[PDB]
Amino acid sequence: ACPLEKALDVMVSTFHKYSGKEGDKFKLNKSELKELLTRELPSFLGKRTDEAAFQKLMSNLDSNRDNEVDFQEYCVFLSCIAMMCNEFFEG
Amino acid sequence: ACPLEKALDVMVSTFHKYSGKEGDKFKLNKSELKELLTRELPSFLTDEAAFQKLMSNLDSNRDNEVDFQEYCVFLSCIAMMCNEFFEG
């Protein structure tokens, strides 16, 4: 597949790598989200190292209030990181 | 390697490969979007009428261009389609 198709496939696979670990195999609980951010997004996790700060990030991602981050919420998260980095591209 | 960080870099850079050709260099007009879709997302594709209803849908603020935020909303939706298939 072409680069952007492969990027989409990595978005999907990386989510399930972590969501399937515990409980609802299709949503990220706090431990799963933490492990995804730390392993998979180490360039972008900075301030969120602090536990209260990570829980705040988590409560912002969880827009339907069911205590987990589902795939849509995770895509919105990734889109926010992309929009952050795009500010830097545009200058 | 962090495949998800590589994914993110491709999501940003691919947009700018096309948005710079005409008009606002930070937005895709319909011609630039058709190029991007044809060349970068061929698996997701088509007539010109098809490119137009897709354009309409992506351009959620009705300014006749697809901006970076609209493009990320689109890519989220395509990932969601693939995810729904993955889940079964």
């Binding site: 827009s63 849509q72 919420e73 895509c75 919105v76 889109s79 926010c80 | 897709l54 849908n57 992506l58 959620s60 935020q69 990320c72 909303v73 689109f74 989220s76 939706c77 969601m80 389609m81």
Partner: peptide, 14 residues
């Protein structure tokens, strides 16, 4: 999010 809302809007259109 405005973004979550926008994703839901578009997904229902595509």
């Amino acid at each position: 999010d405005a973004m979550n809302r926008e994703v839901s809007s578009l997904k229902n259109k595509l």
